[PDB]
Amino acid sequence: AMTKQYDYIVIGGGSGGIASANRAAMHGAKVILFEGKQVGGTCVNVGCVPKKVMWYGAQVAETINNYAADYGFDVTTQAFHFDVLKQNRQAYIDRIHDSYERGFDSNGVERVYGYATFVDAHTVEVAGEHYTAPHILIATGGHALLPDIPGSEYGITSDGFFELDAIPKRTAVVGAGYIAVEISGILHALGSETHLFVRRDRPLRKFDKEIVGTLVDEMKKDGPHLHTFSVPKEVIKNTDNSLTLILENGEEYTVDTLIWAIGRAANTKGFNLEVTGVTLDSRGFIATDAFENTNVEGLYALGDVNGKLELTPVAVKAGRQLSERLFNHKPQAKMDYKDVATVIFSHPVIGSIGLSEEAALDQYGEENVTVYRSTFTSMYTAVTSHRQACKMKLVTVGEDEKIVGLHGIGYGVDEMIQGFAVAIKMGATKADFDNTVAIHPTGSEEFVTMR
Amino acid sequence: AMTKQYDYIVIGGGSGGIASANRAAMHGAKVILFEGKQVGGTCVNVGCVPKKVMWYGAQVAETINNYAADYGFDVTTQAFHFDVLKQNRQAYIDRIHDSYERGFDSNGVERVYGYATFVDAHTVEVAGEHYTAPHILIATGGHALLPDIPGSEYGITSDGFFELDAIPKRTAVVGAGYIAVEISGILHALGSETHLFVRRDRPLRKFDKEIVGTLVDEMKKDGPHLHTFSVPKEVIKNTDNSLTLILENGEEYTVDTLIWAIGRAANTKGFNLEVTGVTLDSRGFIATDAFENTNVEGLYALGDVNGKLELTPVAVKAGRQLSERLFNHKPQAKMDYKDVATVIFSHPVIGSIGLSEEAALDQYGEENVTVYRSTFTSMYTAVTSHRQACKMKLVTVGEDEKIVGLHGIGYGVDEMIQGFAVAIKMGATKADFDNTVAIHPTGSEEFVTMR
Numbered sequence: 001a002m003t004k005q006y007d008y009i010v011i012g013g014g015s016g017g018i019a020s021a022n023r024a025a026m027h028g029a030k031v032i033l034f035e036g037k038q039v040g041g042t043c044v045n046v047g048c049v050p051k052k053v054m055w056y057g058a059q060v061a062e063t064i065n066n067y068a069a070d071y072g073f074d075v076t077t078q079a080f081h082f083d084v085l086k087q088n089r090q091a092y093i094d095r096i097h098d099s100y101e102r103g104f105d106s107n108g109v110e111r112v113y114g115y116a117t118f119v120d121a122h123t124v125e126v127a128g129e130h131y132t133a134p135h136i137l138i139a140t141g142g143h144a145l146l147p148d149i150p151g152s153e154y155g156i157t158s159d160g161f162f163e164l165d166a167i168p169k170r171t172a173v174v175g176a177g178y179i180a181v182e183i184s185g186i187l188h189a190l191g192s193e194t195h196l197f198v199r200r201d202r203p204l205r206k207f208d209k210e211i212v213g214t215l216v217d218e219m220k221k222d223g224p225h226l227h228t229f230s231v232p233k234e235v236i237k238n239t240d241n242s243l244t245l246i247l248e249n250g251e252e253y254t255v256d257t258l259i260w261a262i263g264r265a266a267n268t269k270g271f272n273l274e275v276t277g278v279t280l281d282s283r284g285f286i287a288t289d290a291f292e293n294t295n296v297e298g299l300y301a302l303g304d305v306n307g308k309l310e311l312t313p314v315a316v317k318a319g320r321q322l323s324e325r326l327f328n329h330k331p332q333a334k335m336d337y338k339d340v341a342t343v344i345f346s347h348p349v350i351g352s353i354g355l356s357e358e359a360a361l362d363q364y365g366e367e368n369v370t371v372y373r374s375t376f377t378s379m380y381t382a383v384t385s386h387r388q389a390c391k392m393k394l395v396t397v398g399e400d401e402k403i404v405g406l407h408g409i410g411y412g413v414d415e416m417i418q419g420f421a422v423a424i425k426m427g428a429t430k431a432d433f434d435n436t437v438a439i440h441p442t443g444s445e446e447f448v449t450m451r
Numbered sequence: 452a453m454t455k456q457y458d459y460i461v462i463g464g465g466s467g468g469i470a471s472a473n474r475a476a477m478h479g480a481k482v483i484l485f486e487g488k489q490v491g492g493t494c495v496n497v498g499c500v501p502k503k504v505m506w507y508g509a510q511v512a513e514t515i516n517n518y519a520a521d522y523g524f525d526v527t528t529q530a531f532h533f534d535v536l537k538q539n540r541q542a543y544i545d546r547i548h549d550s551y552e553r554g555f556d557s558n559g560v561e562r563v564y565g566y567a568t569f570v571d572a573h574t575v576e577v578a579g580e581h582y583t584a585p586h587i588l589i590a591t592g593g594h595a596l597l598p599d600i601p602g603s604e605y606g607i608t609s610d611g612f613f614e615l616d617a618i619p620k621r622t623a624v625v626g627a628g629y630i631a632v633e634i635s636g637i638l639h640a641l642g643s644e645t646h647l648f649v650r651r652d653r654p655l656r657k658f659d660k661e662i663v664g665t666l667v668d669e670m671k672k673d674g675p676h677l678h679t680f681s682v683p684k685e686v687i688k689n690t691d692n693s694l695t696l697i698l699e700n701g702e703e704y705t706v707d708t709l710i711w712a713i714g715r716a717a718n719t720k721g722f723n724l725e726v727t728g729v730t731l732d733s734r735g736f737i738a739t740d741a742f743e744n745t746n747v748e749g750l751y752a753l754g755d756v757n758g759k760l761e762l763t764p765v766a767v768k769a770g771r772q773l774s775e776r777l778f779n780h781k782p783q784a785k786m787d788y789k790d791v792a793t794v795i796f797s798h799p800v801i802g803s804i805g806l807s808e809e810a811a812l813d814q815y816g817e818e819n820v821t822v823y824r825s826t827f828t829s830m831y832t833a834v835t836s837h838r839q840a841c842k843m844k845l846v847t848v849g850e851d852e853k854i855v856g857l858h859g860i861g862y863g864v865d866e867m868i869q870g871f872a873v874a875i876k877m878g879a880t881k882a883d884f885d886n887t888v889a890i891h892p893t894g895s896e897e898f899v900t901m902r
């Protein structure tokens with residue numbers, strides 16, 4: 001069987017691969033995409049989408065349990081059917097799969113649902129057939145890490161969290177990143193006795209400290225039990241099938257399910273990447289330049305596998321810009337990785353753009369940083385017996401007070417950030433914010449009324 | 452008793468008057484403020500604040516009644532106690548009152564809770580005493596209009612809506628503006644058989660037609676009963692105390708409560724404004740220049756009474772800018788009334804900045820306008836049996852596609868608009884939006900991923 005020629009081969013049908021394959025096809029490239037598991041990759045199947053559906057479920061629980069009575073509603077929960085939530089979650093995800101397949105047909109992207117293995121730098125094997133192209137994108141994503149301790153195998157990862165068919169009575173979540181925080185918040189809201197174990201002082205250690213302080217204070221009021229300076233030593237499986245987590249400090253916790261959310265690493269093994277000559281960086285990600293080029297001409301890498309910024313919209317935009325470059329004659333087209341906004345679906349949620357106050361002071365010096373901050377109680381919660389704080393801040397630099405960081409935590413913050421991210425990308429200053437008329441009554445107006 | 456001398460007299464203790472009085476006092480002016488009713492004016496007592504608390508109660512109802520089951524929560528409502536909601540709403544408002552009084556004391560603003568009547572162009576009478584100043588601000592607000600038909604007196608206005616101590620079993624809401632749409636939306640969510648009557652083909656006629664199309668479709672699915680081409684002829688009070696609304700088309704609707712939300716007019720009567728020589732415009736508002744000057748030196752007018760834009764933050768900023776000009780040596784200080792964002796707390800919410808597609812076409816010409824859109828189902832509702840559309844639109848002009856209009860309708864839109872308002876005030880183009888990385892998964896990202 002002769003080797004099949006293509007203009008572009010995309011390895012991975014996740015956010016990055018789909019985005020790049022579709023854009024290449026829209027510019028006339030003969031493109032083929034390979035996916036060894038399910039279309040949509042991590043975000044659609046075991047990431048952002050199912051996480052957000054579950055977060056909405058947690059919002060519903062909070063409404064019923066914490067706020068309804070104070071708005072006059074005397075309600076009783078006859079039962080909670082996790083299976084109903086999961087079936088509706090999966091039906092939504094299946095519709096997303098269908099949409100991607102309709103998109104490939106429309107754009108003319110060929111795809112084979114099979115695992116791709118390199119034969120040489122410009123050739124891969126899938127289901128026994130060989131395929132070659134002068135352009136090959138490695139968009140293979142990452143995977144969850146497991147600690148190297150006795151009993152590590154008794155824990156599950158975020159993938160296993162989505163495989164659950166019921167809320168465990170008691171759950172341990174180990175980790176200090178956004179995934180650990182999100183999962184632990186959802187589990188607590190949905191009724192699990194939830195314990196969050198962070199290795200050092202607090203979760204989200206690199207985030208703005210003032211904002212994370214409120215996260216910690218609110219979790220204490222309504223959230224998982226937080227255990228600081230908690231370093232896992234071992235996990236024991238007891239006779240009754242429960243798990244006991246043993247920490248280096250000697251403390252022990254018994255739970256039904258234990259979730260490792262300690263980090264993610266690049267998917268670089270199992271597909272004969274070594275024959276390509278592609279170099280990895282010191283953290284194990286595929287090394288790339290500003291244009292997603294590996295060290296080998298005709299091989300590119302983007303999305304989670306390049307380690308730059310593990311977010312769906314980053315993979316999508318980088319993938320689209322690469323295709324603009326390779327197939328639409330734009331040698332300068334590339335991803336802009338600066339001031340990318342994020343939202344962490346904690347409870348309450350955190351929204352962030354740019355530098356923390358700590359990073360700004362480190363970079364610019366205390367004499368050149370001016371911080372504006374507003375702290376209040378979200379109106380939604382203010383009238384109830386479960387009042388919740390909201391903290392917002394603008395980190396500015398220089399005489400013209402250019403906004404280099406914007407952060408908030410509180411009810412509704414998840415939908416506030418995107419617009420401000422446009423303004424920050426345009427170089428907004430405090431004056432630009434002052435020139436904007438507030439929208440009342442909203443939480444978002446507090447960002448433009450600080451003084 | 453001689454006439455008391457002041458630097459500044461503010462007639463009205465609402466959003467505009469409070470803001471202007473406080474800022475004038477901060478710059479050393481001897482200021483006195485007069486308020487004939489409650490401190491805080493319309494927004495605090497019978498406007499934005501109580502409206503928003505009620506809207507949150509409606510959102511809780513929607514969660515319980517429409518979405519909870521599909522998230523796996525089988526919930527029953529034993530009772531709805533409107534009194535609980537109202538008491539918490541009033542407590543919140545009372546705290547605002549207290550904070551204003553403390554602020555006046557701190558800032559050095561004198562106030563008398565009495566109605567002010569003009570004696571001459573520079574002198575007012577309050578509780579028998581005379582007061583004079585070379586600067587007098589008329590910030591008297593507006594009032595709800597009542598139709599001139601038999602039985603008009605049986606209806607209440609939005610003030611009466613806040614006086615209600617229970618949700619009426621059946622409610623008629625008459626009008627086509629944001630107040631009618633918001634009130635009818637709240638009444639329906641909270642359980643009233645609600646009928647909304649508009650005089651022409653649709654509500655919110657000045658808003659972008661495609662956005663209103665979604666509003667109408669969603670209202671037909673889940674909202675009040677909408678009656679178009681419906682002009683009130685008379686209201687009959689029946690022997691059982693119900694009210695029958697009779698329309699010019701012959702239809703009759705029997706309800707328990709009827710709310711007139713047909714428009715608001717300036718407060719210009721009853722305080723001897725005629726002796727000042729202040730000119731009114733053809734719509735009955737106090738005419739003013741860009742600096743809030745009336746035609747009479749030493750007399751100013753801002754907030755709802757000047758007719759420019761009926762919004763709290765507008766009244767606040769105009770009042771502050773006026774005090775900057777009069778008392779802080781800033782002759783060019785003034786309000787910027789262009790591209791002021793608004794949110795309408797309809798079901799679902801509408802957010803808007805700038806020109807509708809129709810207005811942009813009229814102004815710039817068809818050859819010079821380009822529109823972008825996103826139409827989807829909000830993820831929150833997508834997994835339920837009450838799926839709700841979300842629609843977003845960018846209206847752009849010229850070769851650079853400057854954004855002159857931004858509009859959205861759907862879940863969470865209320866918190867999305869503020870940040871985009873900053874970007875538009877900075878002169879954002881479609882390229883500036885394209886340059887901004889999306890935040891996923893949110894509704895807000897759909898504003899920056901249109902093609």
Ligand SMILES: Cc1cc2nc3c(=O)[nH]c(=O)nc-3n(C[C@H](O)[C@H](O)[C@H](O)COP(=O)(O)OP(=O)(O)OC[C@H]3O[C@@H](n4cnc5c(N)ncnc54)[C@H](O)[C@@H]3O)c2cc1C
Nearest residue numbers: 012014015016036041042043047116141303304310311312
């Ligand atoms: C729990 C969780 C929550 C998250 N929440 C968010 C969020 O709220 N917002 C956000 O922006 N991001 C979020 N992320 C991150 C987001 O999911 C990733 O940044 C994104 O999926 C990366 O896209 P990608 O294309 O690089 O990789 P992936 O989507 O992981 O795609 C890689 C694909 O390649 C396939 N593959 C690998 N090797 C081969 C091979 N040899 N042959 C064929 N196929 C192969 C895999 O099967 C996989 O489907 C979350 C991640 C997790 C784990």
Ligand SMILES: Cc1cc2nc3c(=O)[nH]c(=O)nc-3n(C[C@H](O)[C@H](O)[C@H](O)COP(=O)(O)OP(=O)(O)OC[C@H]3O[C@@H](n4cnc5c(N)ncnc54)[C@H](O)[C@@H]3O)c2cc1C
Nearest residue numbers: 463465466467487492493494498567592754755761762763
């Ligand atoms: C139902 C409703 C909902 C609303 N929702 C919103 C919203 O969501 N967002 C928004 O931005 N805006 C909203 N508004 C509009 C907002 O309330 C007004 O734009 C704002 O209150 C106007 O402020 P003002 O200072 O001009 O007038 P007001 O706040 O009305 O203050 C005028 C004051 O002057 C007093 N007064 C009048 N004459 C005299 C006199 N001779 N002597 C002494 N005192 C006098 C009155 O008692 C009154 O307190 C809403 C309005 C209504 C009615």
Ligand SMILES: OC[C@@]1(O)OC[C@@H](O)[C@@H](O)[C@@H]1O
Nearest residue numbers: 412413414415863864865866
């Ligand atoms: O007004 C609250 C709200 O609209 O804020 C934005 C989103 O968080 C929504 O879930 C939420 O209902």
Ligand SMILES: [Cl-]
Nearest residue numbers: 018019022023
């Ligand atoms: Cl795509």
Ligand SMILES: [Cl-]
Nearest residue numbers: 156157159160
């Ligand atoms: Cl797992």
Ligand SMILES: [Cl-]
Nearest residue numbers: 080082167191
């Ligand atoms: Cl359960």
Ligand SMILES: [Cl-]
Nearest residue numbers: 262263264265
């Ligand atoms: Cl990681």
Ligand SMILES: [Cl-]
Nearest residue numbers: 652653656660
């Ligand atoms: Cl029309």
Ligand SMILES: [Cl-]
Nearest residue numbers: 789790791805
């Ligand atoms: Cl305008």
Ligand SMILES: [Cl-]
Nearest residue numbers: 820821822823
């Ligand atoms: Cl167009």
Ligand SMILES: [Cl-]
Nearest residue numbers: 830892893894
């Ligand atoms: Cl979403």
